[PDB]
Amino acid sequence: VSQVRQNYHSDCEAAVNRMLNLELYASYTYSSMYAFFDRDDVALHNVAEFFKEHSHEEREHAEKFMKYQNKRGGRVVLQDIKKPERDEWGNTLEAMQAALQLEKTVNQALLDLHKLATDKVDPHLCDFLESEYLEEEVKDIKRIGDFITNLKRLGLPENGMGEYLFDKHSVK
Amino acid sequence: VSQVRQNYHSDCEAAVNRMLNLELYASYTYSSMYAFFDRDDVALHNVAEFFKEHSHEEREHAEKFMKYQNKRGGRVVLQDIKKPERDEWGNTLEAMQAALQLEKTVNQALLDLHKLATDKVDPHLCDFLESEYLEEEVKDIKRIGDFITNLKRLGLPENGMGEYLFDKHSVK
Amino acid sequence: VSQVRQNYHSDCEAAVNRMLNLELYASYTYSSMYAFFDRDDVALHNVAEFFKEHSHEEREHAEKFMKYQNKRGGRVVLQDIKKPERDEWGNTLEAMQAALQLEKTVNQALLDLHKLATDKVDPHLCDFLESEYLEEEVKDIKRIGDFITNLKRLGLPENGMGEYLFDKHSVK
Amino acid sequence: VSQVRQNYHSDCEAAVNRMLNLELYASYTYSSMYAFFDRDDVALHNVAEFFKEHSHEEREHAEKFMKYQNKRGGRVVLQDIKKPERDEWGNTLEAMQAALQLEKTVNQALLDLHKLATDKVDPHLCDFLESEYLEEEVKDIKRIGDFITNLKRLGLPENGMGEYLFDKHSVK
Ligand SMILES: [Cl-]
Ligand SMILES: [Cl-]
Ligand SMILES: [Cl-]
Ligand SMILES: [Cl-]
Ligand SMILES: [Cl-]
Ligand SMILES: [Cl-]
Ligand SMILES: [Cl-]
Ligand SMILES: [Cl-]
Ligand SMILES: [Cl-]
Ligand SMILES: [Cl-]
Ligand SMILES: [Cl-]
Ligand SMILES: [Cl-]
Ligand SMILES: [Cl-]
Ligand SMILES: [Cl-]
Ligand SMILES: [Co+2]
Ligand SMILES: [Co+2]
Ligand SMILES: [Co+2]
Ligand SMILES: [Co+2]
Ligand SMILES: [Co+2]
Ligand SMILES: [Co+2]
Ligand SMILES: [Co+2]
Ligand SMILES: [Co+2]
Ligand SMILES: [Co+2]
Ligand SMILES: [Co+2]
Ligand SMILES: [Co+2]
Ligand SMILES: [Co+2]
Ligand SMILES: [Co+2]
Ligand SMILES: [Co+2]
Ligand SMILES: [Co+2]
Ligand SMILES: [Co+2]
Ligand SMILES: [Co+2]
Ligand SMILES: [Co+2]
Ligand SMILES: [Co+2]
Ligand SMILES: [Co+2]
Ligand SMILES: [Co+2]
Ligand SMILES: [Co+2]
Ligand SMILES: [Co+2]
Ligand SMILES: [Co+2]
Ligand SMILES: [Co+2]
Ligand SMILES: [Co+2]
Ligand SMILES: [Co+2]
Ligand SMILES: [Co+2]
Ligand SMILES: [Co+2]
Ligand SMILES: [Co+2]
Ligand SMILES: [Mg+2]
Ligand SMILES: [Mg+2]
Ligand SMILES: [Mg+2]
Ligand SMILES: [Mg+2]
Ligand SMILES: [Mg+2]
Ligand SMILES: [Mg+2]
Ligand SMILES: [Mg+2]
Ligand SMILES: [Mg+2]
Ligand SMILES: [Mg+2]
Ligand SMILES: [Mg+2]
Ligand SMILES: [Mg+2]
Ligand SMILES: [Mg+2]
Ligand SMILES: [Mg+2]
Ligand SMILES: [Mg+2]
Ligand SMILES: [Mg+2]
Ligand SMILES: [Mg+2]
Ligand SMILES: [Mg+2]
Ligand SMILES: [Mg+2]
Ligand SMILES: [Mg+2]
Ligand SMILES: [Mg+2]
């Protein structure tokens, strides 16, 4: 084993690799949403840019796991980044709903990794998750839920005027 | 077809999607190189950061194709991003050799897309490739080739001192 | 022939004159749109100013062809600038639709001139078109298409509220 | 008991005193390394200064435990600070190896104190360790491991040139 490795369970190392992959997967999904809202027949640029920014953030989430792995003396092992579930995302409401579910998936994985770290008595990994991931997730989930509520209030999916208004006044 | 689409062949649209995927693939390979050189048993941080920067640049290459696709009225279609060919990259020389070959692969794909664009009489796509991709590729290939020459001169792979010296004085 | 003229085909020279005229024609059409949206019974000033700006840009497009002609040793030959197709432009959606079609007409002419330049083996004229015209056209067409999509989403032509909202939040 | 003391187990109080002593011990070891590399027959001043800085940091680690003890209403109890294990440290590689082991010892003690705090249901002490100690330890261990790898690559212990080069280009 690595000269630096101390108190780092094989199962945690593997789970960190799987989490890295899921962050990459989330990033790629958000990229797809960006491209959809930039289509000439969709054309919601502030929405598009929201998703582009999220994609970038998710990729940074992934990079932080790679650095973490090396710091602990684990070994980064990459897998394919699966394409997103959909090719097209309907409208702002459908997309935000999909983002909520994605975030909930990511959050569940983070919470599961925290339970594993707890079980293996790895306080450093617990602290990393709590200090760099769990609160950011809660905030993001809240933001997306708030957006969904407002999209529904605006009459989505049917009310195009409402969709326009959201792009112009929310997504800031 | 899209209201914006004009002089944009289906075959070019598809080839742009495939190129997008290859840029993503290149990005991911460079990320793997970064992680390898950041290992505690490798520990060539300037080398690592070179590859991290390249990864970031390649992802920007990919994003520019997505924007291009939408601007022309094509439709972005994503595929899985295949994991890199290797899990570990040997040493600085082996990695740089692999990067040269990757770049040559990417460049060939760009040149093939330019030939297709030429065949389909798409000057806008030709100009995009020439103005945003082909020269950047030539420069990168030259830089990597120069590095290889210097790594060989330094005695790689056997000469660890030489490898150290490269990390400390080249990769700027 | 001119002392400066080199590799400049008579057919390209003539086509440059015709293109100059079409740019002037486009400019004049946009001026008409400006005046329509400034009417007291139309009164969409941000829309009006969008079209005024476009008119100005198109006139600059024309001037650049005159300079080009002289630089190559061709001779500028002017024709009448035909009045626009319509005297009145309906509403924002109808106008944007007409602008899309105008731009597509202009773009087609530019692409046809590029094919002619290619046929006559005139790389300088190809480069001029690619570097000064073709990308600006793609961007403009995309912008107008995006606007159309949003006008439709807003309920045009029937939804006056939607038209108002567009003038106040798009056309920036 | 102290008027301030709440949820602070006698066993944790004692363990904090023992940890304080170990931080002092680590500091003193690093001072010894500093003095060794400053010898006229060793003369690796950047190496020396690395160890001097570490000594200073370790003493600050100790002071933070004294403050912690008082904040919780425990009582600081000091013991002798044992002299370092060695009087002379061989060379840069041997010293870095000894530092790695020292850090691993300190880290193990911190992790053991965290387990005790967990067992006694003391979240404040857990948080203190996680927020002020555990990550700093991981970073330091990684840094030292990286140095070891590079010293080995440089040919230590035999390659004096390599040792010189390390002092002049690493230890920044
Ligand atoms: Cl371990
Ligand atoms: Cl294990
Ligand atoms: Cl967080
Ligand atoms: Cl409003
Ligand atoms: Cl087409
Ligand atoms: Cl086609
Ligand atoms: Cl380029
Ligand atoms: Cl040197
Ligand atoms: Cl001529
Ligand atoms: Cl001629
Ligand atoms: Cl242009
Ligand atoms: Cl108590
Ligand atoms: Cl007690
Ligand atoms: Cl810390
Ligand atoms: Co469509
Ligand atoms: Co933007
Ligand atoms: Co994430
Ligand atoms: Co990054
Ligand atoms: Co997220
Ligand atoms: Co966030
Ligand atoms: Co408003
Ligand atoms: Co190893
Ligand atoms: Co760095
Ligand atoms: Co690239
Ligand atoms: Co980007
Ligand atoms: Co590249
Ligand atoms: Co480059
Ligand atoms: Co030097
Ligand atoms: Co009237
Ligand atoms: Co005005
Ligand atoms: Co024009
Ligand atoms: Co002018
Ligand atoms: Co125009
Ligand atoms: Co060309
Ligand atoms: Co060019
Ligand atoms: Co324009
Ligand atoms: Co002596
Ligand atoms: Co000094
Ligand atoms: Co310490
Ligand atoms: Co102090
Ligand atoms: Co320490
Ligand atoms: Co905890
Ligand atoms: Co905490
Ligand atoms: Co430190
Ligand atoms: Mg080893
Ligand atoms: Mg394992
Ligand atoms: Mg699949
Ligand atoms: Mg926090
Ligand atoms: Mg909020
Ligand atoms: Mg349509
Ligand atoms: Mg097709
Ligand atoms: Mg495979
Ligand atoms: Mg260039
Ligand atoms: Mg150079
Ligand atoms: Mg003459
Ligand atoms: Mg003639
Ligand atoms: Mg007439
Ligand atoms: Mg250009
Ligand atoms: Mg836009
Ligand atoms: Mg008292
Ligand atoms: Mg006691
Ligand atoms: Mg003794
Ligand atoms: Mg912290
Ligand atoms: Mg470092």
Curated annotation (Swiss-Prot), chains A, B, C, D:
Binding-site residues, Fe cation 1: E23, E58, H61
Keyword Metal-binding: yes
InterPro entries xref list: Ferritin, Ferritin-like, Ferritin-like_diiron, Ferritin-like_SF, Ferritin_CS, Ferritin_DPS_dom
One record GO biological process: intracellular iron ion homeostasis
Residue numbers binding Fe cation 2: E58, E103, E137, D140
Any one Gene Ontology cellular component term annotated for this protein: cytoplasm
Statement: the UniProt record of this protein carries the keyword 4Fe-4S: no
Positions of the Ferritin-like diiron domain: 6-155
Broad class of enzyme this protein falls into: oxidoreductase
Coiled-coil regions, chain positions: none
Alphabetized UniProt keyword annotations: Iron, Iron storage, Metal-binding, Oxidoreductase
One GO MF term attached to the UniProt entry: ferric iron binding
SUPFAM superfamilies xrefs: Ferritin-like
Catalytic reaction list: 4 Fe(2+) + O2 + 4 H(+) = 4 Fe(3+) + 2 H2O
Subunit field text: Oligomer of 24 subunits. The functional molecule is roughly spherical and contains a central cavity into which the polymeric mineral iron core is deposited.
Miscellaneous comment in the UniProt entry for this protein: There are three types of ferritin subunits in amphibia: L, M and H chains. M and H chains are fast mineralizing; the L chain is very slow mineralizing.
Family stated for the protein in its record: Belongs to the ferritin family.
Function: Stores iron in a soluble, non-toxic, readily available form. Important for iron homeostasis. Has ferroxidase activity. Iron is taken up in the ferrous form and deposited as ferric hydroxides after oxidation.
Name of the protein this chain belongs to: Ferritin, middle subunit
Organism per entry: Aquarana catesbeiana
